[PDB]
Amino acid sequence: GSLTEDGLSYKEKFVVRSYEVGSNKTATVETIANLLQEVGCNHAQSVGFSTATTTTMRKLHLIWVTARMHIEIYKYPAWGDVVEIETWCQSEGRIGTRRDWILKDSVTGEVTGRATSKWVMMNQDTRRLQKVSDDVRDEYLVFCPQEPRLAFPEENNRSLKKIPKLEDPAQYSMIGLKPRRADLDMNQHVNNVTYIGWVLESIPQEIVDTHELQVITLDYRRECQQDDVVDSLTTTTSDSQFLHLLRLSGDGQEINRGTTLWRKK
Amino acid sequence: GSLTEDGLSYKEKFVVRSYEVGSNKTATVETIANLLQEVGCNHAQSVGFSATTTTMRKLHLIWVTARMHIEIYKYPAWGDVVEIETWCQSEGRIGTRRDWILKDSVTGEVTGRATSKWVMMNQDTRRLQKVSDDVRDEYLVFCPQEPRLAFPEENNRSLKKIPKLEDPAQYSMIGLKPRRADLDMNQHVNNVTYIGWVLESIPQEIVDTHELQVITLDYRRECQQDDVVDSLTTTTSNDSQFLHLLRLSGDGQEINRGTTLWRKK
Ligand SMILES: O=c1ccc(OC(F)F)c[nH]1
Ligand SMILES: O=c1ccc(OC(F)F)c[nH]1
Numbered sequence: 001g002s003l004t005e006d007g008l009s010y011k012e013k014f015v016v017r018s019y020e021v022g023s024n025k026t027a028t029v030e031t032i033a034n035l036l037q038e039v040g041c042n043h044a045q046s047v048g049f050s051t052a053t054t055t056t057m058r059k060l061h062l063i064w065v066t067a068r069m070h071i072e073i074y075k076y077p078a079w080g081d082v083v084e085i086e087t088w089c090q091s092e093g094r095i096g097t098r099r100d101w102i103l104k105d106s107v108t109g110e111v112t113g114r115a116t117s118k119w120v121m122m123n124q125d126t127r128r129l130q131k132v133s134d135d136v137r138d139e140y141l142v143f144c145p146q147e148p149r150l151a152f153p154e155e156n157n158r159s160l161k162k163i164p165k166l167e168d169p170a171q172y173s174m175i176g177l178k179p180r181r182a183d184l185d186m187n188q189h190v191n192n193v194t195y196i197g198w199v200l201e202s203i204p205q206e207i208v209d210t211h212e213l214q215v216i217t218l219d220y221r222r223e224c225q226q227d228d229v230v231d232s233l234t235t236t237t238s239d240s241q242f243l244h245l246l247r248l249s250g251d252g253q254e255i256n257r258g259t260t261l262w263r264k265k
Numbered sequence: 266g267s268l269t270e271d272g273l274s275y276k277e278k279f280v281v282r283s284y285e286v287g288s289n290k291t292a293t294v295e296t297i298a299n300l301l302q303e304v305g306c307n308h309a310q311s312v313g314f315s316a317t318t319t320t321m322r323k324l325h326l327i328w329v330t331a332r333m334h335i336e337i338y339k340y341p342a343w344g345d346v347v348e349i350e351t352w353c354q355s356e357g358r359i360g361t362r363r364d365w366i367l368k369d370s371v372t373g374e375v376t377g378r379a380t381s382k383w384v385m386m387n388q389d390t391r392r393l394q395k396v397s398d399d400v401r402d403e404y405l406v407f408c409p410q411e412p413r414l415a416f417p418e419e420n421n422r423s424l425k426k427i428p429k430l431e432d433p434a435q436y437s438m439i440g441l442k443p444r445r446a447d448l449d450m451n452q453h454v455n456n457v458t459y460i461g462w463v464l465e466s467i468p469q470e471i472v473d474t475h476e477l478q479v480i481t482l483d484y485r486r487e488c489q490q491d492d493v494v495d496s497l498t499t500t501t502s503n504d505s506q507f508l509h510l511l512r513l514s515g516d517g518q519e520i521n522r523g524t525t526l527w528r529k530k
Binding site: 017018019021022023025028030034037038041042045079080176177178180181182184185186187188191193197198200201208 | 282283284286287288290293295299302303306307310343344440441442444445446448449450451452455457461462464465472
């Protein structure tokens with residue numbers, strides 16, 4: 001992959017692997033979510049970040065953490081196909097950061113999906129959220145479009161809707177979910193993609209067999225740690241819509257909420 | 266990737282991805298095992314398969330893994346290119362072998378090797394059988410005719426008999442369940458998942474302070490989507506050796522056994 005001409009966005013091509021696809025021989029949403037995160041990392045390497053901590057962030061032990069992940073897929077790429085992913089970052093002034101992605105058929109050049117994500121600043125030791133400094137903004141505005149560039153430009157759009165809290169009892173549930181070493185990143189934290197899978201695990205197999213996932217919106221409230229256990233809850237709200245809750249098996253502490261939308265095949 | 270000049274082997278290059286690495290910023294043995302399966306699949310595609318031959322599709326026959334053997338000298342680093350070569354060979358009427366060599370792309374030196382034994386099984390009845398001449402002949406056109414062994418040595422750890430762990434196990438991980446990211450395109454648990462499940466009963470202190478050199482895994486029965494696995498480990502030993510058993514948490518039915526060898530970092 002490479003920075004584009006203006007050095008304000010990054011593109012990479014990926015061949016869809018045998019193990020990356022589900023029962024219709026197209027990419028899972030989790031494969032897709034892993035590819036967004038790889039091209040996010042490849043963009044940060046290309047422009048000097050880490051080896052996405054800036055020099056000021058390293059000083060005060062500050063990190064970016066995902067608050068929100070929104071993905072819309074029109075077509076899942078097939079086993080053996082090339083997908084082109086472009087990604088850029090923007091400042092939401094002092095609130096935090098946004099990363100946006102556009103997914104294209106390499107062969108046709110047509111948009112096959114789009115994703116947006118909200119990142120906020122956290123201490124790392126104390127895990128306390130805060131506003132972005134100001135000294136920090138200047139150091140990464142050099143790497144972002146100055147004019148707004150939005151994967152989801154439409155005024156009132158799915159990617160910005162408030163998500164309510166599922167009320168007990170849930171229509172469906174998958175209890176006793178536990179991460180393994182394959183679910184951890186290189187800093188030994190549970191990978192953000194794992195949560196996407198744990199949310200999807202309470203959807204009935206019959207919906208998955210007969211529908212395609214078109215939109216997922218997931219809020220991240222709190223981390224699941226190595227020795228935690230998650231319950232996954234789902235109620236139909238409706239094309240079919242679901243409301244989703246991830247919480248710890250014990251004390252029922254919320255880790256995530258979300259919604260998904262599925263089309264009939 | 267592509268077939269070599271003689272068309273009796275297949276080569277492919279892989280860039281190691283952000284999410285594919287552990288705490289050393291090098292590839293996990295599960296990332297390695299996934300890459301081996303992708304190059305195995307790309308070789309079968311290249312020589313005209315879809316990995317069943319005409320006669321097997323007629324008789325509803327498939328290859329299934331009886332054994333995986335993997336030895337790693339160096340785990341490739343995040344961003345590095347690993348080159349993997351692969352070929353099959355007939356083992357008479359017993360089954361087939363698939364063998365792999367991993368190289369540093371930049372240096373050309375061998376950094377891993379792996380060998381696997383596959384047997385013929387009825388898709389439906391799940392009954393093992395010997396390989397028939399009509400089938401042996403259909404796939405010898407793709408295999409080197411002289412022997413080519415990744416593990417040639419006369420007394421080599423890839424062929425040793427593996428004993429059954431005796432209760433009580435020294436270590437255990439209880440209540441392991443596949444999620445949908447553990448399934449392949451045919452909705453069977455991925456052979457790499459059992460590797461991860463075997464590794465989950467190794468204490469974190471061994472993993473933090475040692476590197477996996479060798480893994481040998483036997484495949485007895487598969488885990489269904491709605492089964493639950495227990496993972497057991499006893500130390501059997503400068504080098505730490507362990508003995509492994511995966512079994513179904515209910516009735517204690519054996520799904521896998523194996524051994525691992527680790528060196529101090
Ligand atoms: O561990 C955390 C804490 C917070 C968060 O999101 C923030 F917006 F609330 C994500 N992950
Ligand atoms: O379901 C099966 C059938 C066979 C097998 O391998 C064979 F060696 F036992 C593994 N898993």
